Amino acid sequence: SVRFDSVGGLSNHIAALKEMVVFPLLYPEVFEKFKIQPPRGCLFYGPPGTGKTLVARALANECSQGDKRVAFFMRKGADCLSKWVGESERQLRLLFDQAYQMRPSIIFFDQIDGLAPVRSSRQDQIHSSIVSTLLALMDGLDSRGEIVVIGATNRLDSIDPALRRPGRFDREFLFSLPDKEARKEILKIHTRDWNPKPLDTFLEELAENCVGYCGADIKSICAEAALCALRRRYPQIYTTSEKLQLDLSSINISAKDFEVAMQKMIPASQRAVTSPGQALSTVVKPLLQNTVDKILEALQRVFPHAEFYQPMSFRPRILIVGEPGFGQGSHLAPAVIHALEKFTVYTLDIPVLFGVSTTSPEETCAQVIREAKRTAPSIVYVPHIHVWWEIVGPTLKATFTTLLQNIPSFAPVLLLATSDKPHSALPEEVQELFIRDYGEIFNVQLPDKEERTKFFEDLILKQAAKPPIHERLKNLLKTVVKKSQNYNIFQLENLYAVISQCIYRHRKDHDKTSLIQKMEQEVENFSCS
Amino acid sequence: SSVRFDSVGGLSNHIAALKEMVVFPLLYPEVFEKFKIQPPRGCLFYGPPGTGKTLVARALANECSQGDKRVAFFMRKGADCLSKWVGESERQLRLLFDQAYQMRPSIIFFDQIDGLAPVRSSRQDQIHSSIVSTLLALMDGLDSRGEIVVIGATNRLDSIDPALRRPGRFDREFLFSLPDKEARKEILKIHTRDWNPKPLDTFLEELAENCVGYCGADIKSICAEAALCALRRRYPQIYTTSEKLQLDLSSINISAKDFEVAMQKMIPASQRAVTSPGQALSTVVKPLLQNTVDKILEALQRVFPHAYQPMSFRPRILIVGEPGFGQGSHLAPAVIHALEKFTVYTLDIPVLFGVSTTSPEETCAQVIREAKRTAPSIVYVPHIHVWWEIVGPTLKATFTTLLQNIPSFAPVLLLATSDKPHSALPEEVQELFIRDYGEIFNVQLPDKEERTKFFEDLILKQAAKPPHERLKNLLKTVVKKSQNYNIFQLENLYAVISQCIYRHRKDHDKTSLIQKMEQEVENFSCSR
Ligand SMILES: Nc1ncnc2c1ncn2[C@@H]1O[C@H](COP(=O)(O)OP(=O)(O)OP(=O)(O)O)[C@@H](O)[C@H]1O
Ligand SMILES: Nc1ncnc2c1ncn2[C@@H]1O[C@H](COP(=O)(O)OP(=O)(O)OP(=O)(O)O)[C@@H](O)[C@H]1O
């Protein structure tokens, strides 16, 4: 029994939808003033779990509380199929007759994509017949009354082109994944009636830590946490096999319960394809934070839409270049992509183009470019262009070059790429796409002495000098930081692991100085060049 | 239920040629028997979706139903005759025909006939073949059905059994194309007739040219969304209440900004699944290339006279220019958009390969055949100097052979753009253009006047907003310094200029951004 209250972050859509069916049943004077006859059709589409069905259910539950009373008809995917020849096209006719009898009413076709495909001469005739009769019913010789048709779909492009037209489906609503803000309202709604209400700061600090959670993940995590407290409180519940009596007044939920559930589950989005966004690990942050900030500020210079009448830009493009082993295409670009949320990102790389065996790669590229254009602004991600170029046939190169050229000049679509060879060493065809004079090239340099000092600061001496459950180590830190003053990233974290290995080697030694000499031997025995 | 040959607009030839079939034999019956004519009694409407077909049927039925001469009317859906029992699938058609004959004259209407009579084939069931057979043998066989007229409608004409399409069964076919400039104005006149504050005709005429690619139901939906937007602008407090309020029906007038918002929010029905290869100049870039567009149009008028009947012989043209001059991205789409009422067929890399499950040769043959069917038309091949190298010899031979078989005097234009000069283009391309005839156009950079007109609007008026001699100095310096830049450099400079105006929005005092504009002027250097 939800009535326009469990929804979160969707204000414009509900306003349009209540303009959609409620106004003619409430204010039948403005419409007759100019003979408007407002529209009677909608179409929902988007990634799963965004609240596609909850909106319809809330509408049906709310509007049934008349006056004015509103009926409802719900249908599954392909209920209108039978073995004989003359029933499938008759179920729709009798359904329309019944709905017209009790007008006004609402007819909701659930997942029309499995009912009305694109017309073709290759498949069976039954699909053509049913799509034809459905097409005739919506707008025939006689006009239908006060019926409203609603449809949902996961693949918008698979619908017959003759259905999308003023008269049948004249409005298309895009349901996207929730942004940073809406998660707060979702958490508030799902955790409303709790006696120990969590503070708004608690909810917000949970909010920035959940990226890629889509509607149902939030509901799942709220229920996967209240069970951790139950399991912790009364461990001896599984042993028995009979009814027990409990004490439900001291099982209040704590903050520490949320962390375990968060580490245990994964979002629905990052379940079938890896998401091309990862925040820096807690170990690498005090080594690359400043560089990442510099990259984003340069992007802000070149991409005005990254601020936080409209800004105007002209073909935003950026490229990151640096020596191999600098971690540019492995740690920097994912962090940059993750920092810029609320922007849909599409991946174009070797694993994806050849990762499907049913379609040509150029078809995939055209589809990706079209989808990027449709929902601008967006970021097109393509890593390691210096190897990416000399792998595909000339046809794909020409198609990619032309498709990008046809985008409107002021359309804010970003092109992000990374390379290992220097700019002058790249092939020319790449070269006349980056205009460094304009400020489209960013170079990478190794971190300074203070950053490297902070990198090893925590290990020595806080973890090594940690009691099992102090001056020579300064010289060890000095010699380590002076020795590693010309190391790339990979060598830097490689050296970090080997020391932690001998750190973990000595769990139960309460007497020190039995491994400090081992430490100073290991740091000098190790040699990389 | 109150439409009678008046709510229809823009269709005159079809309605004129239609009433001569179901009215003339009854109104003037003393002429046909002199020549024993038995005039044709078959029609089949077809066209792109949303062009207003069923409205014609509704108007005809409503007009003929009420009048001095009474004629019956029967209606059918797509495949509403099929029944589970074997003996009832085809018997319903016989009963319907008998009833129609018993009450002659009468009218039989099939809606979406393509869902009832597919082409006969051996790779499907038998009931469809049986229905097709009895239909084609029952309409005109050994009995001379007499005065019965059959009308069908569909969107896919090529999916009809050819045995049904020959005189005797389906006599005439009518083409329902998208409305042009004048028809859109007429349908606007039709759809806004009963408004108390009657809009001026000069407003509708101006608005008509803005709605390119629209057709029928799109116009009808716009005319309603406009009123909804007006109600939105007038009483924005209506959505935060679950109770009826008190409304005053005196301040609900319509303004132009409402139509602007509605047009911005909406997109046409035709180019929804794909994109048409035609776009007009944006307002920002417009005051730079109208002279070039007009010169190009004059060149076409010299070569293509369709812009006594005019005569032409294989019209061709080729726009060439240096890279960065903006000929393959700003000029050709403008020409295509300006020359409307000619159906377009694009042909380039993203279309030849972008769709799989077919061969390029099939696509190119189909495009040319279709363009020949709907002559006159336009064939567009952009970026020829690269398009000529990413195709195999087979496609080259097929294309070079196809355009030689078309009739010589048919008006089939071929349009293409090039970047390298015509001298450097390879062989077999230089012989397709006969520039001695005047088949080659050369572009050149815009001069000082339009350059100044481009920047004066931004740097004189927009630069000084309520929320001054040095402005002339900045304008003249900017114009002087950029007298050798191409289109891309000009738009980049425009954007980098506008960035400062954006970023200094909330400062009430000027002279803080004029300096910033200066350093932007000297610090910004192009590559050239
Ligand atoms: N704003 C929201 N508030 C509460 N629950 C939401 C919200 N958005 C999505 N949901 C969750 O999604 C469900 C309703 O939509 P649901 O996710 O079942 O449809 P969908 O998966 O998007 O569409 P389909 O299942 O057809 O692909 C509810 O069970 C609810 O937990
Ligand atoms: N020239 C016109 N004059 C008036 N109304 C028009 C015109 N063209 C289109 N329309 C409007 O557009 C609608 C088109 O409906 P109709 O079913 O007749 O077209 P259709 O192409 O047969 O539809 P579909 O393709 O969906 O079967 C009509 O209801 C009509 O009001």
Query: Largest sheet of chain A, described in full?
Result: 5 strands, parallel
**Separation of termini of chain A?**
68 Å
Using the CA coordinates, give the radius of gyration of chain A. Answer: 30 Å
The residue fraction in helices of chain A comes out at 40-55%
Kindly name the structural category of chain A.
alpha/beta
Q: How many beta strands in the DSSP annotation of chain A?
A: 10
Q: Give the CA-based shape of chain A.
A: globular
Give the bound compounds.
Answer: adenosine-5'-triphosphate
Q: Biggest protein-protein interface?
A: A-B, 68 and 69 residues
Query: DSSP strand (E) fraction of chain A?
Result: 5-15%
Oligomer: part of a larger assembly
Number of helices of chain A: 21
Strand ordering within the main sheet of chain A: 2-3-4-1-5
Explain the overall architecture.
This is part of a larger assembly, with 2 copies of chain A. Helix content of chain A is 42%, strand content 9%. Chain A has 529 residues and is an alpha/beta fold. In chain A, the strands form 2 sheets. Chain A has a 5-stranded parallel beta sheet with strand order 2-3-4-1-5, covered by helices on one side. In chain A, strands 7-8-9-6-10 form a 5-stranded parallel beta sheet, sandwiched between helices. In chain A, helix 13 runs parallel beside helix 15. Chain A is globular. The termini of chain A are far apart. Chains A and B meet through helix 1, helix 2, helix 5, helix 13 and helix 15 of A and helix 4, helix 9 and helix 19 of B. The complex binds adenosine-5'-triphosphate (2 copies). Residues 6-8, 48-54, 111, 152, 154, 186, 189, 215-216, 219 of chain A line the site of one adenosine-5'-triphosphate. One adenosine-5'-triphosphate sits between chains B (7-10, 49-55, 187, 190, 216-217, 220) and A (139, 162, 165). The PDB classes it as gene regulation. The entry lists the keywords Histone chaperone, AAA+ ATPase, gene regulation. The entry is titled "Human ATAD2 Walker B mutant-H3/H4K5Q complex, ATP state (Class III)". Chains A, B are ATPase family AAA domain-containing protein 2. Organism of A, B: Homo sapiens.
